[PDB]
Each structure stands twice: as C-alpha cells, then as structure tokens.
C-alpha cells in the first residue's frame, strides 16, 4: 500500500458488486478490470443456514468472504495485507443488486436472466467464465430427469473426465489448473484413454504426492494455495470430486425445457459452420476439511420467441459436497452424493 485511498482488491471488488455490476457509469476500462476481479470469486462449502458461500483470495493478499443465508441476508468480510478486518451486514434490502452477482443458487419463480458487459469459441469460453460467477435459479427435482435416478447412474464419469480434462476451465481452491496441467492430472488418475478407469491405488489413496506436486508447480496461484491443492489431491475424495464433476448427465434437468432452443441455435448456427458447450468447474476444500464441487456447463441457446434472432448462453450449475469417506466408485457415489441443479440464461446487450 502506497496511498491512503488505495483499496485492496477484495475491497475494490466488493464495492463494485453492491453498487451494481451492470451500473452504466463504468468506463469499459473499468468493466474490464471488474471482470478480472470477479473471476477470483470461488463458491465454497456453505454452512447450515447458508444458500451459498463465496470466497475470493487475491494476489495483493486481500480476501473477500460472503455468506448468503436462506432468508437472503448477506454478510461480507474483507481482509487485507495490513490486517484490517472490515465487516458489513446487508440485512435490509441493500443486498438487492449484489445477489445477482455471485456463485449462488436462489429460489426463484422463473429462470434468472443476465446480460454481458460471441462468434468463435474463445469468446464462448470467456462468457462462461463470467456467468459461472453470476447467480442461478434452482431447478426442482424430478425423478424422470435426475441423472442419479434411473439405470446406470455415473456410468460416464471416467469417459466424461477423460475427454473433459484438457478442455475445461478448472479451479482447485482458487488455483487455476491450465490445460497442460490438467492433462498431467488425467494421467495421474490413470485415465489413458476413453475406456480406462482409475488405478486402484488412486481410488484408495488419491493421486500420488509426486504427481500432486508437479501438477501444482505447473498451475497458477499463490504458494499457500498451491500447498492447499497438493494436500487436496493426496486424498481419495479428490478423485471422487474431480470425476463426478465431469459427469455430463448433470445437464439433463437443465436441458429438459431448453433443449429445443439449444437446437434452434446449433441450427441457426449451422448455416454458418462448431462446438456448443464448454465446462467450468470449481472445487474447494474448506480449512475444516470439507469438499465442495460447483460444476458449470455453458451452452449456446436461442432466446424465447419474443426476442428472435438472439443467441445467448444457458449456464448450468451443479453443486454438492463430497463427504469424507466416499471413494470414486459408482455404486458408492450414487448413495453418497447429493447434487443440486440450477441454471441461468445470459444474453448480449445492444
């Protein structure tokens, strides 16, 4: 810090969020840095009375933490490199705009719609790196569409994982795992090709420490966080959590009502010839040991009939704790994991 009015990253991000992230005033140049801050946000293991819980740890040494209760009251704490512990309660209607701007799932009588601030796929991947940080509406359970009901639940995890890793956006404890690094991880699990499953060593003891370390070395984050990661991977449950995350059938409750518009979109697109979907995943282990997976699949979608010719992104969230003591084993994962499913639609302004 070199100036009294110089804010930590944590503080900068928080002010922007409550003021409104879509507030028109922004300088575009501000909009760019604002997104670059918003992506440090990570959903983590919530507690008894929390809708969801967000955590951001910046490079400057600041930390933003935010809890949203079931009744929707927000508590944010900001820490800084100089040990200030700023705290703020939003219990009136002050959290009004803030709720739209977080990795949380809300009870909502219709599907949440957002706006950006989309030709090629570099574009498509960034749009989801944005919406994976916005809010989603919860999809109520139905037996006909829960991937975890029916015949062969979790049958594709290893295949889905094998082909997912190298192509995903992926965070472990807020440390980004780049494509090269994911590939090492895939190997480290024993996933050579489309039809292999994981070596029983990994299933019983997580990744080896030797691999766990190189993988971190090759990723992007703080030394403290890389160390958090290495410990995470040397755990059986990291296996469960990583593989479960890639389970494509998580998209089914979301696709049930949207699949027709998703088609119109590949069609509307096909007259221009291309991929449709991408992945963005955050996994976190709380300091108390708890594993949480938030899994995102971004997908191109046509808007409803009222706005023809507009294409946006359906963003599907799948969220769950992976309870200590659950190895990566279908019949096991099936009775232990309890995914919760939410979506959002984002469209471009103009």
């Amino acid at each position: 810090k070199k100036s009294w009015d110089e804010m930590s990253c944590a503080e900068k991000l928080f002010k922007v969020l409550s003021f409104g992230l879509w507030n028109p005033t922004y300088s575009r140049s501000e909009r760019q840095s604002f997104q670059e801050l918003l992506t440090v946000l990570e959903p983590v293991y919530p507690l008894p009375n929390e809708l969801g819980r967000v955590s951001a740890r910046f490079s400057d040494g600041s930390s933003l933490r935010i809890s949203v209760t079931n009744s929707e009251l927000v508590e944010a704490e900001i820490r800084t490199a100089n040990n200030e512990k700023i705290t703020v309660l939003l219990e009136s209607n002050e959290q009004n705009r803030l709720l739209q701007s977080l990795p949380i799932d809300r009870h909502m009588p219709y599907i949440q719609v957002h706006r950006a601030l989309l030709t090629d796929t570099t574009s498509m991947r960034n749009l989801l790196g944005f919406t994976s940080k916005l809010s989603t509406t919860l999809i109520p359970h139905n037996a006909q569409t829960d991937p975890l009901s029916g015949p062969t639940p979790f049958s594709s995890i290893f295949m889905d994982t094998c082909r997912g890793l190298g192509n995903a956006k992926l965070s472990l404890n807020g440390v980004d795992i780049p494509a090269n690094a994911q590939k090492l991880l895939r190997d480290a699990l024993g996933l050579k090709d489309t039809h292999s499953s994981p070596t029983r060593n990994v299933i019983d003891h997580g990744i080896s420490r030797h691999d766990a370390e190189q993988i971190a070395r090759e990723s992007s984050g703080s030394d403290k966080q890389k160390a958090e990661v290495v410990e995470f991977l040397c755990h059986p449950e990291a296996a469960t959590a990583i593989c479960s995350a890639f389970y494509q059938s998580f998209n089914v409750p979301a696709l049930t009502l949207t699949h027709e518009r998703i088609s119109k979109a590949s069609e509307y697109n096909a007259e221009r010839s291309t991929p449709n979907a991408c992945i963005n995943i955050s996994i976190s282990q709380s300091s108390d040991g708890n594993i949480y997976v938030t899994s995102h699949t971004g997908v191109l979608i046509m808007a409803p009939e009222d706005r023809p010719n507009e294409m946006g992104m359906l963003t599907n969230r799948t969220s769950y704790e992976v309870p200590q003591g659950v190895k990566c084993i279908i019949d096991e994962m099936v009775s232990a994991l309890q995914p919760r499913y939410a979506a959002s639609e984002t469209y471009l302004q103009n």
Binding site: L255, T274, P275
Partner: peptide, 14 residues
C-alpha cells in the same frame, strides 16, 4: 437423448 444436443469444445481444433 437430450445430451445429444451438446457439442463440447476441444483444444485440438484449429
């Protein structure tokens, strides 16, 4: 059936 509408991005494309 419904997953058939998804076409996942792949690094290996120019």
């Amino acid at each position: 059936a419904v997953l058939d509408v998804l076409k996942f991005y792949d690094s290996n494309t120019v």
